[PDB]
């Protein structure tokens, strides 16, 4: 959770 | 070597290293000019090793090496030797010059080169700082912001930055540490080198010929230190100094101690 | 390859460092979602969302880098372990391994080449009870088998219980844990 | 050794018990007990002594009975219990100092002194009365192997050892860190110390570690564990490893934080501590475990910042120390102590009867050097010249 | 001892367990300033260890007494006992060694340090009162070696700290007449019981019972209860002696020297 | 008696003592011949010397055996003494200092108090074999 | 992280290889090269050196990492070099009329000297050991030596007359100076436009790779003449032009990394 | 009462501190200062003597205890300096050209000098430690030095030609001279207007106390250059008027005689 | 217990040692001080030293009387008792070390692992006394 934020960060890297 | 080491506290005092570190090593004294005109003979060096051979240096061990002035002695010193020691005048108008000396030769230092037209540098911690040695060093800088802008000063109009250094022969500039400066400076005669100061160099001896100490090594207004190899003396002649040194050099030496770091000519490292 | 064969999960005391090693990648077993308890990288996070509403210096240009050096330095070391048959291997990064069984706490030899066979595919979990406080506890504060098992299973229901009848051997792990989450 | 114990009791007894006035209701089975062992004794030729300056004496029993007619004890009868107590006193006396002499690596347990070997026989085997004290029911568990154990309180257990550790050093010790540590007795100081003050260490924090391992594992220990060290907390001037040159200590004491004990059994951890200060307790350890830190004051005032500077210099050292006594301690092994003349017993025969150096114990009995090397012939051996040194001191303080 | 003791109780009468070196004090580490400031360069007040048997106490002065009237200033310490002693054997000496270096303290609520230079002077006019039921019982003015004690339930150390008149020009080079003051006068007193004897039952360094109930309970892992703290941290299980407590205290050490008399 | 009995060079730790009436500690300072910057600026050659060089050594007693009686760190029986005579008020003696301070009773150990010493010792373990 | 201290290692036979740290060295260090005139004669080329660093770029080497320091000739060079990076190279050319001259560079740069001064006016030095030697420098150099008996007289040689001396130096650049070791000299050097050290070989310097462009293998890096020892640093080439050089360098500059080790002091 | 020996004596420390010697070391003792004549010109009254008297009579010290001496010059003063009295005070006025000179009034006053006569044409004279030092008087003393080897010859420098000899004194007051102790010194010196003492240094003269009314601390009192210490009776006093300067001295006169203590001797 | 026992000074071959805990093999390297030309072509006065001079020692145990267990080159207890519990699949003990890896088993010879490695050694040569 605390976490999935950083794996939901990884994920939208594709937005950067 | 990151190894620790270890010990003990029944373990006896092993003999005297002194009168065989005289016969393993060599001293330099570094005098001016003055001296020599002041006492006028030729003689003089053979003199003091003959004296010195009493004292344990043998006959080729002491050398003499004389400088024209304070700042000509800042511009590039070349001590190589396993013992130094320099003899320093007092000026009130070479106060900070002689600081700065002290602050070089005293201290080892870690040099990197700069390239002022094509880069901007800046400072990290309290101890890098730049110095600049030449013939006549003449310093303007301006802060920038983030955004590659001046503050207080103009990028191009060199008449508007803030000069730091007019015509010295050696510069120790500090500026605040975090932000991007830009330079101008004399390259066609000072060479300025961002230099980060490492532990001291515990091969020289500053002796201060003149007034009161004031040598300010560190350049915090805080600590204003007073180190083991930086003697005073108070003088009318030339002489009774170089018989004092003669007389004390092995409470010098005591308070000086080869280097550790490594073998090298120059007053500072260079590792681009 | 120590164990069945080639994984990049298990890639090399020499047991000491090989754990040391293993426990470079637990943190990513932690961040990617393949752990079971409190996860250290959320606690570091619950820090960092606790620490950023309150500090004044905070910009636009300022907390990029800031996440990033957070994420990186908070709680450098830490520890892991693997539970198989009421049997608990532990490892950290600090280069410290413990072998104990769950009902009654004593040591064992630290199975290496089945502690790795082990941590590759079975879940792993996080050390904020880790095994020395846990002990302390044990004996000091004598504790029942559902709560060592949610313990051992670093649960927060009973961690949130421990913790609001203010026992100082897992106040001071916490402690610990802020005092690691510094940047 | 059973026998010995039991002729030393039974002459302690008889010198208490036995006196003028006294009835025999309560000193039957005493004077039953001597009369079957001057029966025991009598007729046997005992001989002691030829090493050292120890002389040579031949004892040859031939003593008399105690009668048991009589109620009240008179003079008549006293005096014949003294001539003859006096006799087996020093016999016994004699006997421990030429057990206390000799030694041997192969059967330290079996007697020595072979007069000794001879009181070990199984015509002898009839005057056990009582094995009651701690020294040889220790001995008898052993020898029916069970659980033993000897109550120390401040235990010699440490050998005296004064040393250092340096992980940042120099030519000229200008700006060192490392760690110093006295351990002796029943006492260990140690000091961290760093002259940076920790400017540049990650998080302006220095960690320390001291780990003692002993020789023979102790249970139920007392301990007080203390912060300043006190004997590294002034200046000093100390010498290199290689006592080339010297180098001055100028120390300035902090508070150990983040400190931690743990007391651990080959490996295996059995108490650990977190800055719990004053009495604590060790139920079964062989390894001690000293961790603490020096965490330099974020919160400074003028006239203590001016001691940690930003530059070499360092003219104030900061430090990190503590105390830990261990004030009592149970042992399965035997060792010396602040409280028992044993050892006192021993090492002062040995330097009387000047007895050469042994096969097993060191010159002098120098307990750094008996300690230090703690294999099981010189336990044996320490163990037995021990007991029979308490028998001694049982009779003749 | 412990059994007839417990007898003794059961058909009430005057017991004693006579103690060596007793843990009677709760660790206590601690300072008081009676004079104080933000920048702390001019500090009065008294530092005390009172730990195990012993009591290390420490009175500094920063001024050596130099406004203070008389050139003198006092100190005084109070311990309370939570149990009487009687026929107590104290050792008393001057100089206590734990607060006679320099030192680096954080304040009372941690916002900030000071040091803490000392220089030691002996104490003069010192008066140590062993007191009961606030009657003082044993006086003793300016004795140092060995005393007595024969009953007592509070100790008092007063003591001055009186400036040179005469002075020699090192040491008058630390005492000047203005505010930096950097050196901080001091003077200690070292006080540890020997011997003792109690109508209850304590800790000692001499006897085991309570690291036999410690181990005991540790290797069982006994949840705490209500009466004993966790861990049984003689600290704060001799900081509230209530009865309930002395009673368990005395069941437990009495079956814990049973035991002891079996198994070691 | 002005004769030896045992001698200790160069070690430290735990020791024996077999018989002795005096104790002689004979030790030395010996200026180090090698000396570093930071310590040889701390010994200069003429008097100001703002540093003292000191040599100590510390020696404690923990067990022995005497021939006549004295006091401890274990037993109660001079307590004992000195508590009744406080509680009842008891004039000084021909014999005891006043108030009994062991200082000045062990500074003269003349036989008759060495005697009575052991007298009221004797007795008052005797008492505290009864009440303690 | 004691310094100046020499204490033992340990280590095992159970230890696995690390990974290469090429890729990581070659950013975290710098590199400097050293060319002759000649090269940028025959090449004519203002964008060589940009060209050079972005090839070097795909062999891992940063942009701000390397450096080209050009140097007219073999002696102009010898004449106090200051070698100042983290792995030099240096080309040489073959000359059979500069072979004592570019062995005497080899000597120096390749080796790690440790120098004291000399002062000729008023002492009479002498060698120890067969590793101190009296190395001298400057534009035109003139050394003339007289060795002396045990009464401090002159042996074939004058201690007033000059003349009387030998001449061991024709006006050279640089000169590594053996003698008979065990005997008092006096010298004669015109010190105005020359100075003199009195060094002392040590363990090599591991930073600076030498490159013989052209004939067979000549430079005798150690003064006996037992050894004539070939080093690992020490390469030679054949050659006709310079482009081709330079991209030999580039492409085979992993084995010049590997075969050169950072330094100790 | 056992004069000229030195015995050990014992103490303790149960004692209590005694009353204060001060306010009758006053009365049983004598002052004696010393101030410039700057300083009665700047004044310009004729009962200012009087007047101090009167105030110091307030802090104990009676009218006939207090003594006022005058001089001239620093260096008047330093020639043949006669200080007896039990409790002596000094006033130095600073000059950076009279720095050495007022360095060795400092190093000859507070330190306490045991003086034999020396021969100089008669004998060759030498130091044995570093505290056996030449101190030469006078109204202009002029001294020359040759030091000599193992066989009485010179080193640099000719015992007949006294212009070849080293100058280390030129027309000064006051020399205190320390030359390389170990070796013999052929001396040539103004004899007619300047007496040469050899002078060993003792333990320091705890009965005067010098006062640098004006600059920084310079004195040097040790010959060693490594120390430069500053005692306790060398204090410093910044000033625009002496008659503030005197005021001064007398209201803190008691610290001044707690940092001073009579002499042993 | 650092007191020599046996000292062999430039004997080689068989030799014997009654009691000991530690060994010390303290061996030189001597120059040759006559040197032949192929020989001094391989020492050069110089630091490159292509090549490096050596001297080895070997040193086997063939015999000895041990008052602890152990394993030898002679029995089959050890191979026994692992081959049972390789065999069983025995989870590992908190005493013996995984797989009993004699090297982290003699490693760390704590009392605990000497005593229940005799027992096992025991029983093992008991049950191989029947089935082998
Ligand atoms: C050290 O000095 C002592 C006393 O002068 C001397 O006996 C000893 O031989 C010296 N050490 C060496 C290695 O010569
Ligand atoms: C070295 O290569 C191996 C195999 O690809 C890899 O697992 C390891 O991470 C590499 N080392 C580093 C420092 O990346
Ligand atoms: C010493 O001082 C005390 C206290 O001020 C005083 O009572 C006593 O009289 C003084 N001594 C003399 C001799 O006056
Ligand atoms: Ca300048
Ligand atoms: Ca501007
Ligand atoms: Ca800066
Ligand atoms: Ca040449
Ligand atoms: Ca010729
Ligand atoms: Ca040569
Ligand atoms: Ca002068
Ligand atoms: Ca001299
Ligand atoms: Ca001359």
Same mark, same amino acid.
């Given at each position: 959770?605390?976490?999935?934020?950083?794996?939901?960060?990884?994920?939208?890297?594709?937005?950067? | 070597?990151?190894?620790?080491?270890?010990?003990?506290?029944?373990?006896?005092?092993?003999?005297?290293?002194?009168?065989?570190?005289?016969?393993?090593?060599?001293?330099?004294?570094?005098?001016?000019?003055?001296?020599?005109?002041?006492?006028?003979?030729?003689?003089?060096?053979?003199?003091?090793?003959?004296?010195?051979?009493?004292?344990?240096?043998?006959?080729?061990?002491?050398?003499?090496?004389?400088?024209?002035?304070?700042?000509?002695?800042?511009?590039?010193?070349?001590?190589?030797?396993?013992?130094?020691?320099?003899?320093?005048?007092?000026?009130?108008?070479?106060?900070?010059?002689?600081?700065?000396?002290?602050?070089?030769?005293?201290?080892?230092?870690?040099?990197?080169?700069?390239?002022?037209?094509?880069?901007?540098?800046?400072?990290?911690?309290?101890?890098?700082?730049?110095?600049?040695?030449?013939?006549?060093?003449?310093?303007?800088?301006?802060?920038?912001?983030?955004?590659?802008?001046?503050?207080?000063?103009?990028?191009?109009?060199?008449?508007?930055?803030?000069?730091?250094?007019?015509?010295?022969?050696?510069?120790?500039?500090?500026?605040?540490?975090?932000?991007?400066?830009?330079?101008?400076?004399?390259?066609?005669?000072?060479?300025?080198?961002?230099?980060?100061?490492?532990?001291?160099?515990?091969?020289?001896?500053?002796?201060?010929?003149?007034?009161?100490?004031?040598?300010?090594?560190?350049?915090?207004?805080?600590?204003?230190?007073?180190?083991?190899?930086?003697?005073?003396?108070?003088?009318?002649?030339?002489?009774?100094?170089?018989?004092?040194?003669?007389?004390?050099?092995?409470?010098?030496?005591?308070?000086?101690?080869?280097?550790?770091?490594?073998?090298?000519?120059?007053?500072?490292?260079?590792?681009? | 390859?120590?164990?069945?064969?080639?994984?990049?999960?298990?890639?090399?005391?020499?047991?000491?460092?090989?754990?040391?090693?293993?426990?470079?990648?637990?943190?990513?077993? /932690?961040?990617?979602?393949?752990? /079971?308890?409190?996860?250290?990288?959320?606690?570091?996070?619950?820090?960092?969302?606790?620490?950023?509403?309150?500090?004044?210096?905070?910009?636009?240009?300022?907390?990029?880098?800031?996440?990033?050096?957070?994420?990186?330095?908070?709680?450098?070391?830490?520890?892991?372990?693997?539970?198989?048959?009421?049997?608990?291997?532990?490892?950290?990064?600090?280069?410290?391994?413990?072998?104990?069984?769950?009902?009654?706490?004593? /040591?064992?030899?630290?199975?290496?080449?089945?502690?790795?066979?082990?941590?590759? %595919?079975?879940?792993?979990?996080?050390?904020?009870?880790?095994?020395?406080?846990?002990?302390?506890?044990?004996?000091?504060?004598?504790?029942?088998? $559902? $709560?060592?098992?949610?313990?051992?299973?670093? %649960?927060?229901?009973?961690?949130?219980?421990?913790?609001?009848?203010?026992?100082?051997?897992?106040?001071?792990?916490?402690?610990?844990?802020?005092?690691?989450?510094?940047? | 050794?059973?026998?010995?114990?039991?002729?030393?009791?039974?002459?302690?007894?008889?010198?208490?018990?036995?006196?003028?006035?006294?009835?025999? &209701?309560?000193? &039957?089975?005493?004077?039953?007990?001597?009369?079957?062992?001057?029966?025991?004794?009598?007729?046997?030729?005992?001989?002691?002594?030829?090493?050292?300056?120890?002389?040579?004496?031949?004892?040859?029993?031939?003593?008399?009975?105690?009668?048991?007619?009589?109620?009240?004890?008179?003079?008549?009868?006293?005096?014949?219990?003294?001539?003859?107590?006096?006799?087996?006193?020093?016999?016994?006396?004699?006997?421990?100092?030429?057990?206390?002499?000799?030694?041997?690596?192969?059967?330290?347990?079996?007697?020595? &002194?072979?007069?000794?070997?001879?009181?070990?026989?199984?015509?002898?085997?009839?005057?056990?009365?009582?094995?009651?004290?701690?020294?040889?029911?220790?001995?008898?568990?052993?020898?029916?192997?069970?659980?033993?154990?000897?109550?120390?309180?401040?235990?010699?257990?440490?050998?005296?050892?004064?040393?250092?550790?340096?992980?940042?050093?120099?030519?000229?010790?200008?700006?060192?860190?490392?760690?110093?540590?006295?351990?002796?007795?029943?006492?260990?100081?140690?000091?961290?110390?760093?002259?940076?003050?920790?400017?540049?260490?990650?998080?302006?924090?220095?960690?320390?570690?001291?780990?003692?391992?002993?020789?023979?594992?102790?249970?139920?220990?007392?301990?007080?564990?203390?912060?300043?060290?006190?004997?590294?907390?002034?200046?000093?001037?100390?010498?290199?490893?290689?006592?080339?040159?010297?180098?001055?200590?100028?120390?300035?004491?902090?508070?150990?934080?983040?400190?931690?004990?743990?007391?651990?059994?080959?490996?295996?951890?059995?108490?650990?501590?977190?800055?719990?200060?004053?009495?604590?307790?060790?139920?079964?350890?062989?390894?001690?475990?000293?961790?603490?830190?020096?965490?330099?004051?974020?919160?400074?005032?003028?006239?203590?910042?001016?001691?940690?500077?930003?530059?070499?210099?360092?003219?104030?050292?900061?430090?990190?120390?503590?105390?830990?006594?261990?004030?009592?301690?149970?042992?399965?092994?035997?060792?010396?102590?602040?409280?028992?003349?044993?050892?006192?017993?021993?090492?002062?025969?040995?330097?009387?009867?000047?007895?050469?150096?042994?096969?097993?114990?060191?010159?002098?009995?120098?307990?750094?050097?008996?300690?230090?090397?703690?294999?099981?012939?010189?336990?044996?051996?320490?163990?037995?010249?021990?007991?029979?040194? &308490?028998?001694?001191?049982?009779?003749?303080?």
């Amino acid at each position: 959770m605390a976490s999935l934020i950083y794996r939901q960060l990884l994920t939208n890297s594709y937005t950067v | 070597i990151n190894l620790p080491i270890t010990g003990s506290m029944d373990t006896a005092y092993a003999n005297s290293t002194q009168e065989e570190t005289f016969l393993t090593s060599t001293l330099c004294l570094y005098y001016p000019t003055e001296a020599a005109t002041e006492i006028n003979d030729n003689s003089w060096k053979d003199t003091l090793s003959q004296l010195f051979l009493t004292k344990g240096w043998p006959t080729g061990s002491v050398y003499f090496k004389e400088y024209t002035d304070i700042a000509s002695f800042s511009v590039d010193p070349q001590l190589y030797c396993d013992y130094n020691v320099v003899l320093m005048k007092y000026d009130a108008t070479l106060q900070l010059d002689m600081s700065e000396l002290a602050d070089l030769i005293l201290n080892e230092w870690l040099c990197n080169p700069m390239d002022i037209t094509l880069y901007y540098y800046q400072q990290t911690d309290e101890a890098n700082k730049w110095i600049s040695m030449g013939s006549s060093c003449t310093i303007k800088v301006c802060p920038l912001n983030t955004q590659t802008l001046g503050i207080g000063c103009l990028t191009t109009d060199t008449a508007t930055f803030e000069e730091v250094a007019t015509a010295e022969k050696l510069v120790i500039t500090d500026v605040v540490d975090g932000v991007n400066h830009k330079l101008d400076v004399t390259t066609a005669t000072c060479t300025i080198r961002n230099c980060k100061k490492l532990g001291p160099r515990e091969n020289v001896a500053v002796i201060q010929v003149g007034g009161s100490d004031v040598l300010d090594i560190t350049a915090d207004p805080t600590t204003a230190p007073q180190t083991e190899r930086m003697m005073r003396i108070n003088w009318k002649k030339w002489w009774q100094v170089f018989y004092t040194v003669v007389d004390y050099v092995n409470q010098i030496i005591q308070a000086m101690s080869k280097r550790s770091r490594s073998l090298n000519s120059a007053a500072f490292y260079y590792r681009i | 390859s120590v164990g069945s064969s080639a994984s990049c999960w298990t890639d090399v005391s020499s047991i000491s460092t090989q754990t040391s090693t293993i426990s470079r990648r637990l943190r990513l077993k /932690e961040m990617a979602t393949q752990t /079971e308890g409190m996860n250290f990288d959320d606690i570091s996070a619950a820090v960092l969302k606790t620490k950023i509403d309150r500090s004044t210096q905070i910009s636009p240009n300022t907390l990029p880098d800031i996440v990033t050096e957070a994420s990186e330095k908070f709680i450098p070391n830490r520890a892991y372990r693997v539970i198989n048959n009421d049997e608990v291997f532990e490892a950290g990064t600090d280069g410290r391994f413990f072998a104990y069984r769950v009902e009654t706490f004593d /040591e064992i030899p630290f199975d290496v080449q089945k502690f790795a066979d082990l941590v590759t %595919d079975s879940p792993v979990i996080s050390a904020i009870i880790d095994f020395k406080t846990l002990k302390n506890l044990n004996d000091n504060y004598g504790i029942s088998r $559902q $709560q060592a098992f949610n313990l051992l299973r670093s %649960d927060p229901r009973v961690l949130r219980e421990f913790i609001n009848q203010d026992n100082p051997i897992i106040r001071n792990r916490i402690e610990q844990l802020i005092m690691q989450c510094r940047l | 050794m059973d026998v010995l114990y039991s002729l030393s009791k039974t002459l302690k007894d008889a010198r208490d018990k036995i006196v003028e006035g006294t009835l025999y &209701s309560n000193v &039957s089975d005493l004077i039953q007990q001597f009369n079957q062992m001057i029966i025991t004794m009598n007729g046997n030729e005992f001989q002691t002594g030829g090493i050292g300056n120890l002389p040579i004496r031949n004892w040859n029993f031939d003593f008399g009975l105690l009668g048991t007619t009589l109620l009240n004890l008179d003079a008549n009868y006293v005096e014949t219990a003294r001539n003859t107590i006096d006799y087996f006193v020093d016999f016994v006396d004699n006997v421990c100092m030429d057990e206390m002499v000799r030694e041997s690596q192969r059967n330290g347990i079996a007697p020595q &002194s072979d007069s000794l070997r001879k009181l070990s026989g199984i015509k002898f085997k009839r005057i056990n009365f009582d094995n009651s004290s701690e020294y040889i029911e220790n001995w008898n568990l052993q020898n029916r192997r069970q659980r033993t154990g000897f109550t120390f309180h401040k235990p010699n257990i440490f050998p005296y050892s004064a040393s250092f550790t340096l992980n940042r050093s120099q030519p000229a010790h200008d700006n060192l860190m490392g760690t110093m540590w006295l351990n002796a007795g029943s006492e260990i100081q140690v000091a961290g110390f760093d002259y940076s003050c920790a400017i540049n260490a990650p998080a302006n924090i220095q960690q320390f570690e001291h780990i003692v391992q002993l020789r023979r594992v102790l249970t139920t220990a007392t301990i007080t564990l203390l912060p300043d060290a006190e004997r590294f907390s002034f200046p000093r001037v100390i010498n290199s490893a290689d006592g080339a040159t010297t180098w001055y200590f100028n120390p300035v004491i902090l508070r150990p934080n983040n400190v931690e004990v743990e007391f651990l059994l080959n490996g295996q951890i059995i108490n650990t501590y977190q800055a719990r200060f004053g009495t604590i307790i060790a139920r079964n350890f062989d390894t001690i475990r000293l961790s603490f830190q020096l965490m330099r004051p974020p919160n400074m005032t003028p006239a203590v910042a001016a001691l940690f500077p930003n530059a070499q210099p360092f003219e104030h050292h900061a430090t990190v120390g503590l105390t830990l006594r261990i004030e009592s301690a149970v042992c399965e092994s035997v060792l010396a102590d602040a409280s028992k003349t044993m050892l006192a017993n021993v090492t002062s025969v040995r330097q009387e009867y000047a007895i050469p150096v042994g096969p097993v114990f060191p010159p002098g009995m120098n307990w750094t050097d008996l300690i230090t090397n703690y294999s099981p012939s010189r336990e044996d051996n320490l163990q037995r010249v021990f007991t029979v040194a &308490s028998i001694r001191s049982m009779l003749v303080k």
